[PDB]
Design a binder for this molecule. Structure first.
Ligand SMILES: Cc1cc(NC(=O)/N=c2/[nH]cc(CCNc3cc(Nc4nc[nH]n4)ncn3)s2)c(C(F)(F)F)o1
Length: 287
């Protein structure tokens, strides 16, 4: 099963040139694809049909596509259409040439406070859009906060995302394991929007501290920490930032801030918050 050099779609009839390998993940292998007619560049995911054999698996993908397709926001990875042949399912996405915030984190460790403000602010703006459109991401993590050439955060990977249709709805079934799971999801207690705030709490912690708040070698232990709400923000951290984190990681989902409330927090309003970040931030702190 060799992947074709040119990717044509039966519907829209646009010919995509497959270029440089961008990376892989699970069953999918991503490539830089160029539209041969306009020269517009996209990220094309090529997933073999032998990976989507179960109708159960094809259900998770078709739910994901529907949620992602409907999104249009400068802080969410674009979904520019999907198609297939007799071997592969092709997904055309917005290009993010600067890897994810995870790669930044592993190279940088604890980032400077102004950078956290920048990254979180853009991430929250994206999450607000999702929430306003009744979408819960459910799997927010550093590896899903993509960066483009302009160091702009783009939220992606909606494989665990769900839509709510009525007020006060509480989701119970989750098909898959998130990275920073909220306590209510572990205890099958029923969950809504506030699980995304929890994840963001972990994200901010991780950026500022340099290590995840519930990081352990053992997985079983990690879940205990989450359930018991066992974590400590080092005393070194700004009181204002540590205050925000503690609220964002409240055991009670209803005592966590809402998305709208995050932007107006003292953490974003008091200290220095840059509007742009250089690509140097991938490797070294900004001078
Ligand atoms: C198997 C699968 C996954 C999936 N979803 C999905 O890819 N979602 C995304 N959200 C954001 C993404 C950012 C892609 N953009 C990039 C990626 C990149 N490199 C890279 N990405 C993974 N590996 N290497 N380099 C540059 N830009 S991909 C679906 C669908 F759409 F069918 F439901 O199926």
């Amino acid at each position: 099963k060799e992947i074709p050099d040119v990717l044509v779609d039966p519907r829209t009839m646009k010919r995509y040139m497959r270029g440089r390998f961008l990376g892989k993940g699970g069953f999918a292998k991503c490539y830089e694809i160029t539209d041969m007619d306009t020269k517009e560049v996209f990220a094309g995911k090529v997933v073999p049909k032998s990976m989507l054999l179960k109708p159960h698996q094809k259900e998770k993908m078709s739910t994901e596509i529907a949620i992602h397709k409907s999104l249009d926001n400068p802080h969410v990875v674009g979904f520019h259409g999907f198609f297939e042949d007799d071997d592969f399912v092709y997904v055309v996405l917005e290009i993010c040439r600067r890897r994810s915030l995870l790669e930044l984190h592993k190279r940088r460790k604890a980032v400077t406070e102004p950078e956290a403000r920048y990254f979180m602010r853009q991430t929250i703006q994206g999450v607000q859009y999702l929430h306003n459109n009744r979408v819960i991401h459910r799997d927010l993590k550093l590896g899903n906060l993509f960066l483009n050439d302009d160091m702009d955060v783009k939220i992606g990977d909606f494989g665990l995302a769900t839509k709510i249709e009525f007020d006060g709805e509480r989701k119970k079934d989750l098909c898959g394991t998130p990275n920073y799971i909220a306590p209510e999801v572990l205890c099958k207690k029923g969950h809504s929007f506030e699980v995304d705030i929890w994840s963001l709490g972990c994200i901010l912690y991780t950026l500022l501290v340099g290590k995840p708040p519930f990081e352990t070698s053992c997985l079983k232990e990690t879940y205990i920490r989450i359930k018991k709400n066992e974590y400590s923000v080092p005393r070194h951290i700004n009181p204002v930032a540590s205050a925000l984190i503690r609220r964002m990681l409240h055991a009670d989902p209803t005592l966590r801030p809402s998305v709208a409330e995050l932007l107006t927090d003292e953490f974003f309003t008091s200290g220095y918050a840059p509007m742009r970040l250089p690509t140097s931030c991938l490797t070294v702190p900004p001078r």
